[PDB]
Amino acid sequence: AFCNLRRCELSCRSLGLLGECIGEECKCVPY
Numbered sequence: 001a002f003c004n005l006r007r008c009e010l011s012c013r014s015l016g017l018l019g020e021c022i023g024e025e026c027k028c029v030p031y
Contacts, residue, residue, distance in 0.1 A: 002021075002024075003021035003023070003024050003025060003026060004026065005019060005020070005021045005026070008020070008021060008026035008027075011026070011028075012028035012029070015028060017029060017030070018030075018031045
């Protein structure tokens with residue numbers, strides 16, 4: 001499976017941030 005970027009985003013949105021995928025995993029970004 002791919003990284004769930006379309007849900008990673010909604011998760012970082014709860015912190016007021018953007019979401020981003022690196023390799024197979026999720027992080028948040030200041031963008």
